[PDB]
Design an enzyme around this catalytic site. Structure first.
Site, short mmCIF file in Angstrom:
data_model
loop_
_atom_site.label_atom_id
_atom_site.label_comp_id
_atom_site.label_asym_id
_atom_site.label_seq_id
_atom_site.Cartn_x
_atom_site.Cartn_y
_atom_site.Cartn_z
N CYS A 171 4.18 1.04 9.38
CA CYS A 171 4.18 0.04 8.32
C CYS A 171 5.57 -0.04 7.69
O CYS A 171 6.25 0.96 7.53
CB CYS A 171 3.13 0.33 7.26
N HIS A 173 0.82 -1.23 0.00
CA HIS A 173 0.00 0.00 0.00
C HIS A 173 0.86 1.29 0.00
O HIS A 173 0.34 2.39 -0.22
CB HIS A 173 -0.99 0.00 1.16
N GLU A 205 0.74 -8.35 0.10
CA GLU A 205 0.95 -7.03 0.68
C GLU A 205 2.44 -6.74 0.82
O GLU A 205 2.88 -5.99 1.70
CB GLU A 205 0.20 -6.85 2.01
N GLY A 252 2.00 4.94 10.76
CA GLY A 252 3.39 5.31 10.67
C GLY A 252 4.36 4.17 10.97
O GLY A 252 5.58 4.39 10.95
C1 LIG Z 1 0.61 1.42 8.40
C2 LIG Z 1 0.41 2.41 7.22
C3 LIG Z 1 0.17 3.87 7.58
O1 LIG Z 1 0.50 4.38 8.65
O2 LIG Z 1 -0.47 4.71 6.61
C4 LIG Z 1 -1.66 5.38 6.96
C5 LIG Z 1 -2.77 4.34 6.88
C6 LIG Z 1 -0.78 1.09 9.01
C7 LIG Z 1 -0.64 0.60 10.47
C8 LIG Z 1 -1.99 0.33 11.12
C9 LIG Z 1 -2.90 1.56 11.09
C10 LIG Z 1 -3.65 1.53 12.41
N1 LIG Z 1 -2.84 0.67 13.24
C11 LIG Z 1 -1.91 0.01 12.59
O3 LIG Z 1 -1.12 -0.76 13.10
N2 LIG Z 1 -1.51 0.15 8.16
C12 LIG Z 1 -2.62 0.51 7.49
O4 LIG Z 1 -3.15 1.62 7.52
C13 LIG Z 1 -3.26 -0.54 6.66
C14 LIG Z 1 -3.16 -0.04 5.23
C15 LIG Z 1 -3.48 -1.10 4.18
C16 LIG Z 1 -2.97 -2.40 4.27
C17 LIG Z 1 -3.29 -3.32 3.25
C18 LIG Z 1 -4.10 -2.96 2.17
C19 LIG Z 1 -4.59 -1.65 2.08
C20 LIG Z 1 -4.28 -0.72 3.09
N3 LIG Z 1 -4.64 -0.81 7.00
C21 LIG Z 1 -5.16 -1.11 8.20
O5 LIG Z 1 -4.48 -1.18 9.24
C22 LIG Z 1 -6.65 -1.31 8.05
O6 LIG Z 1 -7.11 -1.08 6.93
N4 LIG Z 1 -7.60 -1.68 8.90
C23 LIG Z 1 -7.49 -2.07 10.28
C24 LIG Z 1 -8.57 -3.11 10.60
C25 LIG Z 1 -8.45 -4.37 9.72
C26 LIG Z 1 -7.35 -5.38 10.04
C27 LIG Z 1 -8.79 -5.67 10.44
#
Ligand SMILES: */C(=C/C(=O)OCC)[C@H](C[C@@H]1CCNC1=O)NC(=O)[C@H](Cc1ccccc1)NC(=O)C(=O)NCCC1CC1
Length: 181
Positions: A148, A41, A72, A146
């Site tokens: 990822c 992503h 991913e 932040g």
């Molecule tokens: C890391 C990316 C980031 O900081 O960019 C802004 C989104 C982030 C870490 C997590 C966010 C909240 N807590 C965390 O640990 N990941 C994400 O935002 C991912 C993005 C993603 C991943 C794969 C495909 C498309 C987008 N998404 C999520 O964490 C999310 O979408 N949902 C959380 C609930 C679902 C898992 C059940």
């Protein structure tokens, strides 16, 4: 200094980099030669900022499994003089769990960051912002935006890349050595 700290610091020093895409800030893992890996992503374009300079990407490969389901992870090949220290021997041949893992983050906003995520277990399927994903693992730690790209590691082994969380748990895409062969 002891073995686990020495290993994570050495990783930070040699293999784990601060990067920025159009999606913002991520931790990137350099594996060997000009090959690194990022969360899919993060959408790396033709260039990516790495630490202190804009670096050109020669190739990007999004990993899917046999079902065509998103893993991913994106393999990128960089136009650099650097060869990364080869760490493929620290990555297990199959996706492995671990006890008392540490998440190593390296972002401009979260530099050289150590997060004790605890035990890491099989998870498999996970639905991420409408994108289904396989071969994931889970740790019961409230990981946040932040983080990822962050590197899941334990006893000299590199087992995952952080990709998601739900405010109580975090989830990584699991590593296996064949992705980097
Ligand atoms: C890391 C990316 C980031 O900081 O960019 C802004 C989104 C982030 C870490 C997590 C966010 C909240 N807590 C965390 O640990 N990941 C994400 O935002 C991912 C993005 C993603 C991943 C794969 C495909 C498309 C987008 N998404 C999520 O964490 C999310 O979408 N949902 C959380 C609930 C679902 C898992 C059940």
């Amino acid at each position: 200094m002891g073995p686990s700290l020495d290993f994570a610091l050495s990783l930070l020093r040699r293999n784990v980099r601060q990067v920025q895409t159009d999606q913002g800030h991520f931790t990137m893992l350099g594996v060997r030669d000009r090959l690194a890996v990022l969360p899919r992503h993060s959408q790396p374009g033709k260039t990516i900022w790495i630490e202190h300079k804009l670096v050109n990407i020669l190739d990007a490969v999004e990993l899917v499994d046999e079902q065509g389901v998103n893993l991913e992870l994106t393999l990128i090949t960089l136009d650099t003089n650097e060869k990364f220290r080869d760490i493929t021997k620290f990555i297990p041949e199959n996706i492995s769990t671990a006890s008392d893992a540490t998440l190593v983050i390296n972002t401009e906003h979260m530099p050289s960051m150590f997060v004790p995520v605890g035990d890491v277990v099989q998870y498999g399927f996970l639905n991420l912002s409408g994108k289904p994903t396989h071969r994931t693992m889970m740790y019961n730690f409230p990981t946040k935006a932040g983080q990822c790209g962050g590197v899941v590691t334990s006893v000299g082994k590199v087992i995952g890349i952080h990709i998601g969380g739900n405010g109580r748990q975090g989830f990584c895409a699991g590593l296996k050595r064949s992705y980097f062969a």
